[PDB]
Design an enzyme around this catalytic site. Structure first.
Site, mmCIF file in Angstrom:
data_model
loop_
_atom_site.group_PDB
_atom_site.id
_atom_site.type_symbol
_atom_site.label_atom_id
_atom_site.label_comp_id
_atom_site.label_asym_id
_atom_site.label_seq_id
_atom_site.Cartn_x
_atom_site.Cartn_y
_atom_site.Cartn_z
ATOM 1 N N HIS A 41 0.742 -1.156 -0.075
ATOM 2 C CA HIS A 41 0.056 -0.098 -0.157
ATOM 3 C C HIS A 41 0.978 1.189 -0.010
ATOM 4 O O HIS A 41 0.424 2.144 0.037
ATOM 5 C CB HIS A 41 -0.927 -0.069 0.882
ATOM 6 C CG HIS A 41 -0.662 -0.011 2.407
ATOM 7 N ND1 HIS A 41 -0.306 1.253 3.083
ATOM 8 C CD2 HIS A 41 -1.011 -0.794 3.396
ATOM 9 C CE1 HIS A 41 -0.117 0.866 4.387
ATOM 10 N NE2 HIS A 41 -0.357 -0.232 4.618
ATOM 11 N N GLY A 143 1.858 6.099 10.013
ATOM 12 C CA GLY A 143 3.347 5.938 9.424
ATOM 13 C C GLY A 143 3.997 4.795 10.010
ATOM 14 O O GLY A 143 5.278 4.401 9.729
ATOM 15 N N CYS A 145 3.406 1.739 9.576
ATOM 16 C CA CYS A 145 3.344 0.512 8.669
ATOM 17 C C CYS A 145 4.623 0.156 8.195
ATOM 18 O O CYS A 145 5.512 1.011 8.058
ATOM 19 C CB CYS A 145 2.203 0.984 7.513
ATOM 20 S SG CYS A 145 0.516 1.080 7.978
#
Lengths: 305, 305
Positions: A41, A143, A145
């Protein structure tokens, strides 16, 4: 003595954390040998996450669009590929700090350490369990991830989790390092049901043993029970059914303390039916299920890496 | 979102851990620049610890009696000195992995991370608070002495604790890195009273703010209180008295949530007088006091290192 919810030392993982930027999105990557792994993503805009076509979005990207920085050193990206929900960015330099490592897909009820990171920089470390319903209850802000979960055995880091998303319920979902989600979750911003969760019975029992080893023993009683009878109680209280495999894993703790597993089950049965009576166990006013039997053995024996 | 009891990343400290052996005793040392720091009780036999004469015991030792090993590399000891309850072993090589660091003496009620180690090898990491009575509730087995506590700000490691002993009560005592004990404790195997402890009120309030930020808010009410009235309740329940300095430190959390500090005190007052009613807050069935206001701000803002 004493019993704490300890995480593995994180230094071997810290040396693998990088920042990945594609377009305007920045998250964390994991740099092992000459490959950087991160959530796919990273290639989405905020508008894309409702139902992204990841194949089409990735086609619009080239190697030079993936900005990868390890600390202050920029890495040269020489290839890219998507595997399930992860991107693998081949770089021209092998990470000199790569530890001995492997990728594992852990089972629900097992524990691991998370190194929470932002912009490629580590922030903190904590221990947690994969819930029976394949979610985790972590601490993840925007942030985070690409932050990873891991275990360490001897000198080998077993990576088991990469963080992908926060469900609308505030619980967390992610993948193994091959990019396969744990649980039914998908990487798109939609409401997603997490299954019914349960409490990890074999971990509760392990923690009761840890308590006895450390001097908390008010919950021991004069009773015993059977696997059948205990499992009737476990069902009423939404605990995992106990199996003989679970009893076997608890063998070393039973031997050390001299408390038969079914006797400890009778202690747990009474705690479930009557509560803790305003008392605590190892500093907790509820029954703790985030320590596995191995975790208890490890902590009470002082294993190192 | 989510709130966990997170420790600092431990890699910068892992690179400083060594093993120290003198005679038959092995514990951990901390290698910074060309000095190794460790508990002075490394020079005692098991018979010496009842009332050791550390000056006399140290006189019988020479540089070549202190065996210091960093991983598998042996360090050459070129001097030794005792400072309070720590030994400082000068070695001929500066640690190439020394982080930017400083030594700090922390105040009761502040938190820090502990890297538990055995034979110079790290085992795990966890966060904890210095109690008002200058003890800590850790996880320390035989051989863990010399393990250190620390905080990290930016790129600087502030070392604040070295582990020395387990009191007969099972709680833990140690020193700053100048070898001064926190609290009234001495490095000898005798019964030693720890003072009356209290609960760290400003930390409980910070954690209630953390809860509201994360969506746990059932404990908020329609009441307010005064500093005087709240402190009558704090005294009844063995909580630290709240001061204006504490209110000031909570200002940023009050501003973020819009909940005046004295309103949150009224929530805490009701929780103390009535219990939690079988409910939980951030996964806890008791009032948590091991998060400082700074810890809450840091975790909810994603600061990194």
């Amino acid at each position: 003595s004493g019993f704490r919810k300890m995480a593995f030392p994180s230094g071997k993982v810290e040396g693998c954390m990088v920042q990945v930027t594609c377009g305007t999105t920045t998250l964390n990557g994991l740099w092992l040998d000459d490959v950087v792994y991160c959530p796919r993503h990273v290639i989405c805009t905020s508008e894309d996450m409702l139902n992204p076509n990841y194949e089409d979005l990735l086609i619009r990207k080239s190697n030079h669009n993936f900005l990868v920085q390890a600390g202050n050193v920029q890495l040269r990206v020489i290839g890219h590929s998507m595997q399930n929900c992860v991107l693998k960015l081949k770089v021209d330099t092998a990470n000199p700090k790569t530890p001995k490592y492997k990728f594992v897909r852990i089972q629900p009820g097992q524990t691991f350490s998370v190194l929470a990171c932002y912009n490629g920089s580590p922030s903190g470390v904590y221990q947690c369990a994969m819930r029976p319903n394949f979610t985790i209850k972590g601490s993840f802000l925007n942030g985070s991830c690409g932050s990873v979960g891991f275990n360490i055995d001897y000198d080998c880091v077993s990576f088991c989790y990469m963080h992908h998303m926060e469900l609308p319920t505030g619980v967390h979902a992610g993948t193994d390092l091959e990019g396969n989600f744990y649980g039914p979750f998908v990487d798109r911003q939609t409401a997603q049901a997490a299954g019914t969760d349960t409490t990890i019975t074999v971990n509760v029992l392990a923690w009761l043993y840890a308590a006895v080893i450390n001097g908390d023993r008010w919950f021991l009683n004069r009773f015993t029970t059977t696997l059948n009878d205990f499992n009737l109680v476990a069902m009423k209280y939404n605990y995992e059914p106990l199996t003989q495999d679970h009893v076997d894993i608890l063998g070393p703790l039973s031997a050390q303390t001299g408390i038969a597993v079914l006797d400890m089950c009778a202690s747990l049965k009474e705690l479930l039916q009557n509560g803790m009576n305003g008392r605590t166990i190892l500093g907790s006013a509820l029954l703790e299920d985030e320590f596995t039997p191995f975790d208890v053995v490890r902590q009470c024996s002082g294993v190192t890496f």
